[PDB]
Ligand binder design. Structure first.
Ligand SMILES: Nc1ncnc2c1ncn2[C@@H]1O[C@H](CSCC[C@H](N)C(=O)O)[C@@H](O)[C@H]1O
Ligand SMILES: C=CCOC(=O)c1csc([C@@H](N)CCCNC(=N)N)n1
Length: 266
């Protein structure tokens, strides 16, 4: 039962979340995240944009960003599109105040993502959950709720740490505080096996809604898959991958992440 696995790892997830809700700890997590995770942001975004265009033959009308932090993902989208409805939600008041100060045409909500349907009624073409799934107290509840908000042509794209990657994941820590941070983050994470079970359970009773999970770099799609072939044809995704020397090497050295899709096609 995936429910019990999720309930029994709840304390770990609460602990991981202290790194985003405590004043001193938040300084450590921000510094690490900006240094080590910023370059993957554009890759993950262009992956879902390439997927959407390939699958549905139009650009999305709306992106909902779950755990949006200081609004960096929404800023990126704002620079790529003008006529996209952008929404971000984060339970950190400090993060949301920072996002609002950007002065972007976007809606920012300060609340547990569990409460999203109080703030968004129009169905969403893309729901993005980037590098934060393992922080949620009630991840299955959040996903079930998000599925209600999916448009007839839509996807949830989830990218997160794999618990089995802890050992390799510690390599990028540069201080004892960062080491402690990463240990807590990986301990709260799911494994590939657990993540697959979760996405199966939340989609199996939902008509026209499917899932895919993988640990391959580009959306978890194997390099021999038809999906990978289609994604890699997209010049915007190519451009995002064509980054600095140091960031390409960082991306090469990174442990494999979990990549999950919940896809609705009515
Ligand atoms: N239950 C919840 N609802 C909304 N946001 C949450 C949450 N639990 C944690 N978060 C937020 O998740 C973020 C994790 S770090 C930022 C992740 C961001 N999506 C990125 O791509 O880098 C933090 O800002 C934290 O406040
Ligand atoms: C190369 C290493 C890749 O490292 C990361 O992507 C990373 C490390 S810590 C972090 C934060 N965004 C919080 C992660 C929240 N998720 C889980 N704990 N599962 N992201």
């Amino acid at each position: 039962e995936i429910e019990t696995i999720v309930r029994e790892s709840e304390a770990n997830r609460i602990q991981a979340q202290t790194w985003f809700s405590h004043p001193e700890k938040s300084k450590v997590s921000f510094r690490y995240d900006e240094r080590e995770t910023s370059s993957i942001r554009s890759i993950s975004i262009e992956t879902f944009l390439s997927f959407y265009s390939s699958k549905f033959n139009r650009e999305p009308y709306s992106v909902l960003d779950i755990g949006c932090g200081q609004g960096q993902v929404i800023q990126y989208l704002n620079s790529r599109f003008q006529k996209i409805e952008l929404t971000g939600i984060d339970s950190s008041a400090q993060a949301i105040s920072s996002a609002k100060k950007l002065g972007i045409n976007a809606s920012f909500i300060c609340s547990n993502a569990e409460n999203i349907m109080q703030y968004v009624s129009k169905k969403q073409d893309i729901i993005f959950i980037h590098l934060c799934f393992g922080l949620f107290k009630n991840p299955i509840a959040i996903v079930n709720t998000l599925i209600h908000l999916l448009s007839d042509q839509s996807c949830i794209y989830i990218v997160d740490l794999d618990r089995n990657s802890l050992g390799e994941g510690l390599n990028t820590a540069q201080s004892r505080e960062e080491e402690a941070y990463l240990k807590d983050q990986y301990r709260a994470s799911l494994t590939m096996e657990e993540f697959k079970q979760l996405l199966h359970v939340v989609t199996k009773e939902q008509h026209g809604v499917s899932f895919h999970v993988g640990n391959s770099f580009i959306g978890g799609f194997d390099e021999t898959s038809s999906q990978f072939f289609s994604l890699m044809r997209n010049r915007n995704l190519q451009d995002a991958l064509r980054t600095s020397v140091g960031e390409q090497l960082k991306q090469s050295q990174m442990p494999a992440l979990l990549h999950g899709w919940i896809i609705k096609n009515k």
